[PDB]
Amino acid sequence: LDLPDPSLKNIIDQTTLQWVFVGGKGGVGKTTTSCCLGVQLAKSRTKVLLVSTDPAHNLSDAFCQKIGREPTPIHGFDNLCAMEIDNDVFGQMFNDLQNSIPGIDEAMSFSELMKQVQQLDFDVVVFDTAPTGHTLRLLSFPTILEKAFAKVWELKDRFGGLIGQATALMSGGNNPAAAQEQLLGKLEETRAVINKVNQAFQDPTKTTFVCVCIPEFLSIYETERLVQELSKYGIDSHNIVVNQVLFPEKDAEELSAWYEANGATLPKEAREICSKLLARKRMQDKYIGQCFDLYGDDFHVVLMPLLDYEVRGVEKLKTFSELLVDP
Amino acid sequence: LPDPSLKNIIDQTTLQWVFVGGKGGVGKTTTSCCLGVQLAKSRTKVLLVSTDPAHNLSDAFCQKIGREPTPIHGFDNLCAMEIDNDVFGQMFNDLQNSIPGIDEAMSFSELMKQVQQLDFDVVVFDTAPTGHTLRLLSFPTILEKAFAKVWELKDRFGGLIGQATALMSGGNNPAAAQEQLLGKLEETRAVINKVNQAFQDPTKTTFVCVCIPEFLSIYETERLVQELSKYGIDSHNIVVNQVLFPEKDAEELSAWYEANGATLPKEAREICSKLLARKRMQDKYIGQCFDLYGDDFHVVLMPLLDYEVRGVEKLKTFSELLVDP
Ligand SMILES: Nc1ncnc2c1ncn2[C@@H]1O[C@H](COP(=O)(O)OP(=O)(O)O)[C@@H](O)[C@H]1O
Ligand SMILES: Nc1ncnc2c1ncn2[C@@H]1O[C@H](COP(=O)(O)OP(=O)(O)O)[C@@H](O)[C@H]1O
Ligand SMILES: [Mg+2]
Numbered sequence: 001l002d003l004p005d006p007s008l009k010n011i012i013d014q015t016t017l018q019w020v021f022v023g024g025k026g027g028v029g030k031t032t033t034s035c036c037l038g039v040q041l042a043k044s045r046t047k048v049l050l051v052s053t054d055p056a057h058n059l060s061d062a063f064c065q066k067i068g069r070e071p072t073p074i075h076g077f078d079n080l081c082a083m084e085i086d087n088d089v090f091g092q093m094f095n096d097l098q099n100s101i102p103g104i105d106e107a108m109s110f111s112e113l114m115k116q117v118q119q120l121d122f123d124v125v126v127f128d129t130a131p132t133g134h135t136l137r138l139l140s141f142p143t144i145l146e147k148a149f150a151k152v153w154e155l156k157d158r159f160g161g162l163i164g165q166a167t168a169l170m171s172g173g174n175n176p177a178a179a180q181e182q183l184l185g186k187l188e189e190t191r192a193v194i195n196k197v198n199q200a201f202q203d204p205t206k207t208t209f210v211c212v213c214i215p216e217f218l219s220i221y222e223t224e225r226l227v228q229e230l231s232k233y234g235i236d237s238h239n240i241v242v243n244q245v246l247f248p249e250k251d252a253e254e255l256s257a258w259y260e261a262n263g264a265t266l267p268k269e270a271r272e273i274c275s276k277l278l279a280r281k282r283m284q285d286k287y288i289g290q291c292f293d294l295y296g297d298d299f300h301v302v303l304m305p306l307l308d309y310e311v312r313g314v315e316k317l318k319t320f321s322e323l324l325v326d327p
Numbered sequence: 328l329p330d331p332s333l334k335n336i337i338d339q340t341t342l343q344w345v346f347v348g349g350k351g352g353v354g355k356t357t358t359s360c361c362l363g364v365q366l367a368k369s370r371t372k373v374l375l376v377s378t379d380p381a382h383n384l385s386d387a388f389c390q391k392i393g394r395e396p397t398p399i400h401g402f403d404n405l406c407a408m409e410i411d412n413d414v415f416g417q418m419f420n421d422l423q424n425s426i427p428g429i430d431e432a433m434s435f436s437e438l439m440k441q442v443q444q445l446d447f448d449v450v451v452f453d454t455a456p457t458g459h460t461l462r463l464l465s466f467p468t469i470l471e472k473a474f475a476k477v478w479e480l481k482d483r484f485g486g487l488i489g490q491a492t493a494l495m496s497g498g499n500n501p502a503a504a505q506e507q508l509l510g511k512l513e514e515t516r517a518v519i520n521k522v523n524q525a526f527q528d529p530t531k532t533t534f535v536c537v538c539i540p541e542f543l544s545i546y547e548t549e550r551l552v553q554e555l556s557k558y559g560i561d562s563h564n565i566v567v568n569q570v571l572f573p574e575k576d577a578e579e580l581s582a583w584y585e586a587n588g589a590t591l592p593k594e595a596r597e598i599c600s601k602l603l604a605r606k607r608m609q610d611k612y613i614g615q616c617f618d619l620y621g622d623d624f625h626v627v628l629m630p631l632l633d634y635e636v637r638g639v640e641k642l643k644t645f646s647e648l649l650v651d652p
């Protein structure tokens with residue numbers, strides 16, 4: 001067959017990329033893939049930043065080094081930084097909006113993060129995103145903002161009488177109408193930031209998504225959810241990383257023939273372990289064929305081997321990254 | 328105008344659920360406990376349920392209150408209660424991430440089922456602050472949206488789900504897990520449909536809105552009243568709590584102070600001026616309350632006291648003021 005190269009080298013080749021998002025469900029290897037992409041990009045690019053919005057602090061455990069809320073340089077690199085991230089009328093109206101429109105706080109946090117990152121001045125940013133479910137809401141942010149605007153408008157419409165009647169009483173910093181206009185302005189600031197950011201995100205020159213999974217149903221199902229959602233929102237993805245593949249080198253036909261020929265020559269325990277490993281290989285192959293049915297025409301499908309050790313520490317990450325970019 | 332008491336709540340012997348709402352700190356818990364104490368007289372069995380996040384019921388009654396009906400010391404028929412790989416788990420987590428509030432709707436569904444099977448004559452609900460109670464009102468919409476989401480996912484990924492069902496044998500069937508999630512949504516929706524049908528019946532359900540003579544409290548009260556009206560839920564009782572001497576009008580003390588202020592020692596002068604300023608402000612907001620309501624609502628004015636209304640006797644005296652002024 002001829003197909004895209006089964007590596008992430010196309011990411012390194014596209015030198016114009018400014019945002020690389022790494023997605024997938026929990027435990028498939030998002031953080032490892034992100035760290036390896038950062039290590040590889042640090043070669044050609046002037047400055048590379050890794051941002052983790054996954055709730056835990058997995059970045060520190062990955063690099064075996066404490067990572068701060070602001071760009072922490074990585075030991076062994078000069079141009080690789082990492083960063084991990086977790087009376088008053090206006091206050092009441094803002095609280096009411098937060099309770100009414102779930103997700104507006106996430107949108108404002110993401111807006112603030114984008115402002116801070118875009119002012120940090122880096123050549124490329126790799127985002128270790130949260131598990132798929134949370135990233136899908138991240139994608140829905142424009143709808144969340146539109147509903148928040150509609151709520152504030154409905155609120156003005158429905159309670160203008162009370163708000164105007166109260167404006168005459170309370171002096172100083174508690175004019176209700178001014179508080180409503182200020183809440184509109186904060187929503188407007190958030191929406192403008194997110195619109196500029198989304199314009200950059202819909203440009204395949206600057207932004208692409210790497211989807212990580214493992215050869216099991218739930219991982220591939222969440223990958224398909226993410227791929228379709230990204231396509232819906234015009235965000236480019238052309239890389240699937242299938243992680244933790246049980247020895248991708250050898251073929252199930254080959255080892256099945258060997259086992260059917262030579263199983264009874266093995267002690268019972270070795271025979272049982274070989275049989276279990278073969279069944280696991282067959283199942284994984286079923287799911288990898290499913291991946292190539294869904295993708296492969298339009299995606300670089302990278303197969304990564306299951307290792308005995310956790311991929312922590314700089315040297316391990318470098319070896320894994322080399323497997324990632326040229327197998 | 329309607330009588331300035333909550334006696335109409337006691338008179339309507341058909342009431343099954345009385346919800347008490349309002350902003351934080353306005354007196355929801357106090358009013359709920361007092362309504363329960365008063366209802367325990369006419370009704371055979373009365374239950375107080377607290378969905379307020381904190382454990383304020385225990386502090387109110389000065390007694391630890393349990394997760395299931397705890398009888399109240401001094402009462403024979405008044406109980407209170409305070410309230411806190413895997414394909415199915417993954418799909419439910421996806422739904423929780425997609426439809427925020429579905430878990431709250433299911434928790435409320437289970438709570439309502441348990442309450443309806445405890446079989447009480449009347450239940451008084453001390454709700455959480457207004458913002459959360461409004462979402463409670465939106466729960467049926469959230470359930471419909473969750474159903475629609477699971478069906479959209481079923482439609483779009485049926486191919487993948489069935490192809491994986493063919494692979495993994497025995498249990499952990501993804502299609503069965505999706506049908507199981509639909510069935511759990513259906514259970515929840517049936518409970519909440521019964522509950523909402525009871526909520527829209529003024530014979531069985533009414534809302535008491537608590538506020539204080541301040542702008543924000545009245546604003547949240549108006550939000551709550553309009554939301555209840557949208558959803559066909561009855562409210563005809565406003566409790567304005569912590570009123571600074573509700574009997575007298577600020578006019579009298581204003582005339583007295585403007586005449587005789589400088590003849591007072593410094594401390595008396597200062598406290599009198601502070602009290603007068605607060606009373607003037609409170610009177611503006613109480614006039615606002617009577618503008619908004621009073622035509623259609625029983626407006627109960629309750630005095631601000633020096634002590635916190637904790638303990639059974641405090642609750643009894645406050646309840647007497649609440650139902651017969
Ligand atoms: N190819 C692999 N083989 C063996 N273990 C791996 C592999 N890739 C990642 N791991 C380990 O699995 C754990 C989960 O990986 P991580 O990148 O944290 O996943 P995620 O970020 O998607 O939750 C990590 O401790 C990592 O060391
Ligand atoms: N009329 C009143 N005078 C003085 N204190 C009061 C009055 N009503 C309530 N309190 C006190 O104010 C506090 C808040 O009341 P609570 O019923 O807990 O409000 P909510 O439940 O709405 O937050 C309680 O400690 C209560 O004892
Ligand atoms: Mg991660």
Ligand SMILES: [Mg+2]
Pocket residue numbers: 352355356379383
């Ligand atoms: Mg309370």
